[PDB]
Write a protein that binds this ligand. Sequence first.
Ligand SMILES: CCn1c2ccc(CNC)cc2c2ccc(-c3cscn3)cc21
Ligand SMILES: [Zn+2]
Length: 197
Amino acid sequence: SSVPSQKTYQGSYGFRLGFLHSGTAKSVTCTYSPALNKLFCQLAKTCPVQLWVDSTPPPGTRVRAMAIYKQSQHMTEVVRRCPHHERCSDSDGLAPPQHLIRVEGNLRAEYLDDRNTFRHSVVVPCEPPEVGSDCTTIHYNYMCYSSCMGGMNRRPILTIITLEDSSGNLLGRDSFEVRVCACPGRDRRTEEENLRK
Ligand SMILES: CCn1c2ccc(CNC)cc2c2ccc(-c3cscn3)cc21
Ligand SMILES: [Zn+2]
């Protein structure tokens, strides 16, 4: 399959992501490394991702998430759930069981199987922040481990977040690496130490 672009693009509205500062304690379930541009999270746990813009986008703007493999020798392979997890009937009623990325708690989430690339994505309406908040947060879930045999099988992935107009045209783009693992705090600490070395 052809490879969706991962080029960072703020666009007319100044679109970019933001992440909480959750730390690296052994008990943490989701933590983001700015130095690695990498999110570490446990299986199927809530991953808050912030959306930031400098100016107000039009009604009908949407926000899409898609995963691709990071390594060039694997980027043409569709990222999907492994043969076990696609069959474990953990459906939320909306997400197809094959999809790695879900949006949590948004009844207007839509899930796409691309008719030409066969790639999976989940898209929601772009919404302004809640009254009293400075940004909008989407809660994502990753539904396989990076290590799952027959699926990602230890290959690193990226999530690409695109801001789109109502036709699906590109307005903005950002991305981050993801590792779905049992101990995100320890793994973030290890990889940041490896980077320092
Ligand atoms: C991207 C999320 N977001 C913000 C994040 C951050 C900010 C900046 N707050 C200091 C504003 C917005 C914002 C405004 C409007 C809309 C909107 C209108 S009609 C559809 N979507 C969305 C907004
Ligand atoms: Zn799996």
